[PDB]
Amino acid sequence: MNWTGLYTLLSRVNRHSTAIGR
Question: What is the rounded distance in angstroms from the CA atom of residue 7 to the CA atom of residue 21?
């Protein structure tokens, strides 16, 4: 269960890594 950021971070939890074309 990975989250530890849906309460005191939310907008501070970079969803996954940087996007990439391919």
Answer: 31
